[PDB]
């Protein structure tokens, strides 16, 4: 057992998209820089089965390659579909099958015991690539059922550092096996002064810089030093004189929790879409959906409707936003004033038949078709409100048959001249223009209340993790932190300051009755003072007076800083640290904490 350095060795391509001069900062599996990785010295059996946490970054500097194959598998007990790579002399074959590997990882087919029910096999003919000892590096992982293997075999210099070469590298995607079997253990195959360089691709946030040619120029690990943390906050790779803060980069999220829904049985959402003759125009039904789970996928491909004009909320991403109650209406109007169904519109049916408030976070839907109705007999079944002496209030039933009066004198209920009835029949003929087509419109009203959610999206539900820095998106409130099972009963509802600039502290579990306190993983206003990478590569930290003891330090009324020394002398203010005190960069060449020249 031994440790060594793995600087700038382990960076690969996250996806297969060939971009050009972009900024990629996706939190994927990478090997951090300056990580204490194991260095196996081989001339015998010294390397045991290596743990496959999230990926293996193998490397070897040697000539006349005798270490070429790698042994994969979950338990290596002929239980699951293992992986084998046979590239002895000229026939390279990647077989995804159950091989019982014995205690002899070297060659020549005596490595495995026998065969079993095998699976797909890659027939890749390209070979897996007395002057010096060339370097060959490979990256193995498996995510989303894709066993991706990366390789950047390149001629190395003739033993300049003798441990690991300098410069940045990016292993191009070699192959991608479509098998989705899980792998937990890792080993190697000897094809018989080499060296085994392996590491663990622990999940962290990495930043890369692509070019127009395809190569990656720079890359930052965002987890090595406070300067590295600050570099991944401005979305850049060069820094200058200044002081900047970070946001939860020293501790990276491990897993992801959602737990959005709690119900599996759907609701009768199609009864209002496909049924018999609906309501009239003067009267409109209102079905109140209850505890259920929403599945808008069946409303898209089946029964192709018209445009999904959704006002207030986004027209897409409707399978994630969860509400408390969702009401379903019913209506059928003429195909000449349907545009008045939008919020804030005016007209005939939007003034005396059905009004909409100025704030309506719902959506309209229509499946206008004169085939289910409008027979050739004379259509006078549907009625509508004719006129009203007063204005209609939004979301108000109008079940009333009072004698409408529009003359200079009241009619006293006679139905004569200027005393017409306020309900006039409609006429829907199948042979007419587009302006006389029955639009069976429905205004699905989506509102949010203070009650627990009853019908959420169709996504799945993950497991709850306690005492861990993770992300959680329960009811649209995405939060990165640690959840604690506390006893803070009487869930807060802080809205005094209207939530202008304020975050949350605790939430309620949407699955069962529970309280989860949200705590930041690592914060406190950690501001790093970077003088610039052009001068040196040494920075200091400062805290805005939180604890002065994080669970060459000087005490001031601004917090505590580490990485400098206080100077009793005073000079010109160059870099303001805090509370008037400033710093500079003078000769050894470093930063000081001289007093402000007041």
């Amino acid at each position: 057992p031994a440790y060594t350095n793995s600087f700038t060795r382990g960076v690969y391509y996250p996806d297969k998209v060939f971009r050009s001069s972009v900024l990629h900062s996706t939190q994927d599996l990478f090997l951090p820089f300056f990580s204490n990785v194991t260095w196996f010295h081989v001339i015998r059996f010294d390397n045991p089965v290596l743990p496959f946490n999230d990926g293996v970054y193998f490397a070897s500097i040697e000539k006349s390659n005798i270490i070429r194959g790698w042994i994969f598998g979950t338990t290596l007990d002929s239980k699951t579909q293992s992986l084998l790579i046979v590239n002895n002399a000229t026939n390279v074959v990647i077989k995804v099958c159950e091989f019982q590997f014995c205690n002899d990882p070297f060659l020549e087919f005596r490595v495995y015991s026998s065969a079993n029910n095998c699976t797909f096999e890659y027939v890749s003919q390209p070979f897996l690539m007395g002057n010096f000892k060339n370097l060959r590096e490979f990256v193995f992982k498996n995510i989303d059922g894709y066993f991706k293997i990366y390789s950047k075999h390149t001629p190395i210099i003739v033993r300049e550092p003798e441990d690991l070469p300098q410069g940045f590298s990016a292993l191009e995607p070699l192959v991608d096996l479509p098998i989705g079997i899980n792998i937990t253990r890792f080993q190697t195959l000897l094809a018989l002064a080499a060296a085994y360089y392996v590491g663990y691709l622990q999940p962290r946030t990495f930043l890369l810089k692509y070019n127009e040619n395809g190569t990656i120029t720079d890359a930052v690990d965002c987890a090595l030093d406070p300067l590295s943390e600050t570099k991944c906050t401005l979305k850049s790779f060069t820094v200058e004189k200044g002081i900047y803060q970070t946001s939860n980069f020293r501790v990276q999220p491990t897993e992801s929790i959602v737990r959005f829904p709690n119900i599996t049985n759907l609701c009768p959402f199609d009864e209002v879409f496909n049924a018999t003759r609906f309501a009239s125009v003067y009267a409109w039904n209102r079905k109140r959906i209850s505890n259920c789970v929403a599945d808008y996928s069946v409303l898209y491909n089946l029964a192709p409707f018209f445009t999904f004009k959704c006002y207030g909320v986004s027209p897409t991403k409707l399978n994630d936003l969860c509400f408390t109650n969702v009401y379903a209406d019913s209506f059928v109007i003429r195909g000449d004033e349907v545009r008045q169904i939008a919020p804030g519109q005016t007209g005939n049916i939007a003034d005396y038949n059905y009004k909409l408030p100025d704030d309506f976070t719902g959506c309209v839907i229509a499946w206008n078709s004169n085939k289910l109705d409008s027979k050739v007999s004379g259509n006078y079944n549907y009625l509508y409100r004719l006129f009203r002496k007063s204005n209609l209030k939004p979301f108000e039933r109008d079940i009333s048959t009072e004698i409408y009066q529009a003359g200079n004198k009241p009619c006293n209920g006679v139905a004569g001249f200027n005393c017409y009835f306020p309900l006039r029949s409609y006429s829907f003929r199948p042979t007419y223009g587009v302006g006389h087509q029955p639009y069976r419109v429905v205004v699905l009203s989506f509102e949010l209340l203070h009650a627990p959610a009853t019908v959420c999206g169709p996504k799945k539900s993950t497991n709850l993790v306690k005492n861990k820095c993770v992300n959680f998106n329960f009811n649209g409130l995405k939060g990165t932190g640690v959840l604690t099972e506390s006893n803070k009963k009487f869930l807060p509802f802080q809205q005094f300051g209207r939530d202008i600039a304020d975050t949350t502290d605790a939430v309620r579990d949407p699955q069962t009755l529970e309280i989860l306190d949200i705590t930041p993983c690592s914060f406190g206003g950690v501001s790093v003072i970077t003088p610039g990478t052009n001068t040196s590569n040494q920075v200091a930290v400062l805290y805005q007076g939180v604890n002065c003891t994080e669970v060459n330090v000087f005490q001031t009324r601004a917090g505590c800083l580490i990485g400098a020394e206080y100077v009793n002398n005073s000079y010109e203010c160059d870099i303001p640290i805090g509370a008037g005190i400033c710093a500079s960069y003078q000769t050894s060449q470093s930063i000081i904490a001289y007093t402000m020249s007041l």
Epitope: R288, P357, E396, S445, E447, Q495, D499
Partner: nanobody, 119 residues
């Protein structure tokens, strides 16, 4: 024209029903949702009542299941909270705040406040 005045007496007996009223002067928004939030000094504020303006179904909290109910009388445009047997922890400073079900998650109109000392 948004004066949501309240009512109520004084101290409450240690265990017994009560009744509170909330008036709405120059208020005609019959689609807003109502709530009886308690914002007494000390601990945080809570949510108890919920009257669906578009609907009308009574939505209560978890600790007030078998407790006081609400009713939205659209005739006189007032709010009625028929209390029940209260414990020592029911002492609060309930208000009468209404808000729109469509839009933000905060309230829009406030009241004056009432005190219920259960001791």
């Amino acid at each position: 024209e948004v004066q949501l005045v309240e009512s109520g007496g004084g101290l409450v007996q240690p265990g017994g029903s009560l009744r509170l009223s909330c008036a709405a002067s120059d208020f005609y928004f019959d689609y807003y949702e109502m709530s009886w939030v308690r914002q007494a000094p000390g601990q945080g504020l809570e949510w108890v009542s919920t009257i669906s303006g578009l609907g009308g179904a009574t939505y209560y909290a978890d600790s007030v299941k078998g407790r006081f109910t609400i009713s939205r009388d659209n005739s006189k445009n007032t709010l009625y909270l028929q209390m029940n047997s209260l414990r020592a922890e029911d002492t609060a400073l309930y208000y009468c705040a209404t808000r729109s079900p469509f839009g933000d998650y905060a309230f829009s109109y406030w009241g004056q406040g009432t005190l219920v000392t259960v001791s």
